[PDB]
């Protein structure tokens, strides 16, 4: 708020002002990979990749 | 005589069999299924011992 001095104060009334801040989002973050079905005979690398992605 | 509606019917159970399915050479061949997990890491190659002299 403003503060004002004196007795008269005539024609010197102020208004109200409240400011704002905006919160937004970003883009999604991804781990994205492709595997052929022959690569899933042993799936250990696939699981370890999931853990690395986390 | 009797002029009525006509139909065309297909035999549900009778299939004309053509092309023989003989595989004389493949039945004399041996079949091997190696462990797939190791096959994946071994470039789909496995080594077989030969009987030693």
UniProtKB/Swiss-Prot annotation, chain A:
Protein's recorded name: Major capsid protein
Domain notes: The insertion domain (I domain) plays an important role in the folding of the capsid protein by acting as an intramolecular chaperone.
Signal peptide: none
Variant or mutagenesis effect after changing residue 7 to N/V: Drastically decreases capsid stability
Residues of the full protein shown: 55 to 108 of 430
Protein task: Self-assembles to form an icosahedral capsid with a T=7 symmetry.
Residues under site feature: Involved in capsid stabilization and maturation: 7
Localization per record: Virion
Stated family: Belongs to the P22 phage major capsid protein family.
Organism: Salmonella phage P22
Binding partners and assembly: Interacts (via N-terminus) with the capsid assembly scaffolding protein (via C-terminus); capsid proteins and scaffolding proteins form building blocks that assemble to form the procapsid. Interacts with the portal protein.
